[PDB]
Amino acid sequence: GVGKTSIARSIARALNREYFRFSVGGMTDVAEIKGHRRTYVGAMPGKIIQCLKKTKTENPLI
Amino acid sequence: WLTSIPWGKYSNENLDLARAQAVLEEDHYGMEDVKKRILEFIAVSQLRGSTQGKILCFYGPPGVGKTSIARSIARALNREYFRFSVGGMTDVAEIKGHRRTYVGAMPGKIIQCLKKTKTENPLILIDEVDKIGRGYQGDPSSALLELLDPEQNANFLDHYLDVPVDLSKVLFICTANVTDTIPEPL
Amino acid sequence: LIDEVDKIGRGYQGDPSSALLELLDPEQNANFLDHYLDVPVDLSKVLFICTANVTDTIPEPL
Amino acid sequence: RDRMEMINVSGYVAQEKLAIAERYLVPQARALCGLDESKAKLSSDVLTLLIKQYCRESGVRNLQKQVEKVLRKSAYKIVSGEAESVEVTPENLQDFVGKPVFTVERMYDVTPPGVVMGLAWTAMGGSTLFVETSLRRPQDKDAKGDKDGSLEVTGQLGEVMKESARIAYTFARAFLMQHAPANDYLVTSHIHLHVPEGATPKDGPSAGCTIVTALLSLAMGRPVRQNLAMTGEVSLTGKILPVGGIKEKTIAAKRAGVTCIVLPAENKKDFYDLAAFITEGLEVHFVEHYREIFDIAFPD
Amino acid sequence: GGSTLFVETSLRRPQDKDAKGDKDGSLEVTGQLGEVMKESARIAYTFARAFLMQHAPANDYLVTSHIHLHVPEGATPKDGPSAGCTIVTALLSLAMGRPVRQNLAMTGEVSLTGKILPVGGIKEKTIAAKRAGVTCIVLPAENKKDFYDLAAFITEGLEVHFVEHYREIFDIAFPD
Ligand SMILES: Nc1ncnc2c1ncn2[C@@H]1O[C@H](COP(=O)(O)OP(=O)(O)O)[C@@H](O)[C@H]1O
Ligand SMILES: Nc1ncnc2c1ncn2[C@@H]1O[C@H](COP(=O)(O)OP(=O)(O)O)[C@@H](O)[C@H]1O
């Protein structure tokens, strides 16, 4: 609660680039960042892929 | 599924303080703090103009009527009612649905609640949140935070229906006899 | 009639206790449905009996 | 860790939080609730009292929730109550938010013998832990037996903390031998002490100075000087080594009301690196060796 | 919700195995104690010996005596430390053999020195206490406001006792 996220968003706006936050805290399954192998039923890509798809840009703020 | 979703359709919320207070008083005894808080929400919403929805929890022992008071609030407010059990759950799909690809894949239960209520301002109850197990394949706590986040929830989507939905008016209600096992971010 | 309620396994990809609870829920039972059949059914008038040599091992939500 | 440069976000002074809220938060919440300054009014004193009693942390979120709740209550009182416009005073704050939440919170305002205040750079800001020492067995174990005064410790001790406690114990024994050889209290006595949690393991050794101070105070029974704080690390010789998170510890000390404090001379610039308004109302004491602290803690 | 639990202390070894014996009265504990509970009980016994020595040096009962203690389980871990005052009181009563004042209950955390920290869940604790038919209740001074937050129709018959240090607790429990 000291605005680290707030300052990150402010920097995103100042640079004109998009803002996104990733919650790596308490995360161990690297698959979440590396997705799946695409074979498992309903496999998903790494969360970076989802972030890029959402932002629609290749130079957002991470 | 998509068409059945109530798009921009909201129940006519009851905005009269006196009748709501009388209804709550004749529905349950005590809970003066809860009555004060809900009526304060009513007053701000009336002042706020457009209807809105925030999230809160009724934490206390069982047999207290938390579900009963939730029903009383839902009926008094004129908004629809729905409840959800999450205790010991391990499949995030029930929140985020399936991929829609497998034949008969169902969407998240929130989509089903929207379909049933026919409004974008219903009342949703989540119970025994503290009892979640978040075991293998689960970790719905992340999904719970996504669904609850006041800013992100406006663009919440399920795996089945990839398109997002706004949840700035829904009223989520959580219940748990203890405030410790529940995750800190939540 | 449900026989040997106390003997449930509740294992990987099992957990019928949830199915039991939803089936017997006094309000959800009125609109119960399954995977093969996607239609709710009322059960308020159906009568349920259960058997178990012990009660302690019976899951509390049940 | 080494792949980036780590920048610290210390926190906010009570005045700093006051200014931020009255410039950033209060307007934001008022806009969110749709209120106006005319109808919705807040004074500096009410928010200061809120900060001092209703809330206490390095963070600000709790203040955000408090202000939101009081603003919503005022919106209720206007929509429903008889007050077209709300004026907020510490008198009305009791009805608006309720009774004071946090008192001074300082466990001891007198610091009896064997318990000493100490600043710790916890993960969520700073903390003022009251390191406490105690005699687990009467010193008269035997009028002739000189059995070693085996020590006890609690507080989920990690290995490095255990070594810090042991080295501090040995150094305190040596210091007492040199200063007061006639005293065997720390020599022949089964002592226990506790270390409250919160301090990050890297910052945990900073409590060695507090440990030695508490041990000496218990040994000779004179309570440490009131409203006095200390923290540091010893290298078995009384030499005082530098530490990190000094600004957060100073912020906590200020919040704690302690007016006298001792820092390593190495971190002296860092303390001087802080804003003047931060260091108001406190008299620092830069040291390098433990001996000085003794007189500082025990001028008499 | 709330509950009332009878913390019990029993002597599991003769007090005087050997008068000249100087071995400590090693403690034993039950109640499915998490570690933090173990340090809490450790602190409680430390302060118990300290208070006894301060107030009854002639008594070596608590010193050279191996005693066991059971605290009934069920309490949430966050509230488990709140039994420190109760543990100290039970140990003292066993030491001097003076039964505690009847219909008298307490709950709190001790800082190893007798100074009491506040505890949460006061309201349900008081509800159970009344349902336990207990008249005099001892609480921290700090929690006092929370007690006053309660409505009058609950508090009837409660001879509350608000403290910050154990000496007051000792005197209230041991009017003599
Ligand atoms: N200097 C500041 N000015 C305005 N708001 C602040 C400031 N510092 C903290 N905040 C508040 O903190 C919140 C965001 O903090 P955040 O970035 O989450 O910090 P952290 O990452 O440490 O939790 C915002 O709601 C904001 O109002
Ligand atoms: N003050 C009250 N007024 C009316 N009914 C109550 C009250 N307190 C408890 N109840 C009853 O107790 C029942 C318990 O409901 P339940 O779903 O178990 O809520 P909770 O999970 O809070 O115990 C409810 O049906 C309700 O009618």
Author numbering:
A (entry chain E): 526 to 587
B (entry chain C): 464 to 649
C (entry chain D): 588 to 649
D (entry chain E): 650 to 949
E (entry chain C): 774 to 949
Authors' text:
Following its mitochondrial localization, Lon’s NTD specifically recognizes and binds protein substrates, which are then unfolded and translocated into the enzyme’s proteolytic chamber formed of the ATPase and protease domains, where they are degraded into small peptides.
Other hLon mutants were produced by exchanging Tyr186 and Tyr394 for glutamates (Y186E; Y394E), thereby mimicking the negative charge introduced by phosphorylation (hereafter “phosphorylation-mimicking” hLon variants), or for phenylalanines (Y186F; Y394F), which acted as non-phosphorylatable controls (these mutations were introduced to verify that the effects of phosphorylation were not due to the loss of functionality occasioned by the removal of the Tyr hydroxyl group). When either, Tyr186 or Tyr394, were mutated to phenylalanines (Y186F; Y394F), the caseinolytic ability of the resulting proteins substantially increased, with almost all β-casein digested within the first 5 min. The highest FITC-caseinolytic activity was measured for the Y186F mutant, which exhibited the most rapid β-casein digestion and relatively fast TFAM degradation. The Y186F and Y394F control mutations had no significant effect on the ability of hLon to degrade either β-casein or TFAM. Cryo-EM maps were obtained for Y186E, Y186F, pCMF186, Y394E, and Y394F with resolutions ranging from 2.9 to 8.5 Å (based on the 0.143 cut-off of the Fourier shell correlation curve). Structurally, only the pCMF394 substitution had a large impact: the cryo-EM structures of the ADP-bound forms of the Y186E, Y186F, pCMF186, Y394E and Y394F mutants were all very similar, while the pCMF394 substitution destabilized the formation of the ATPase-protease hexamer.
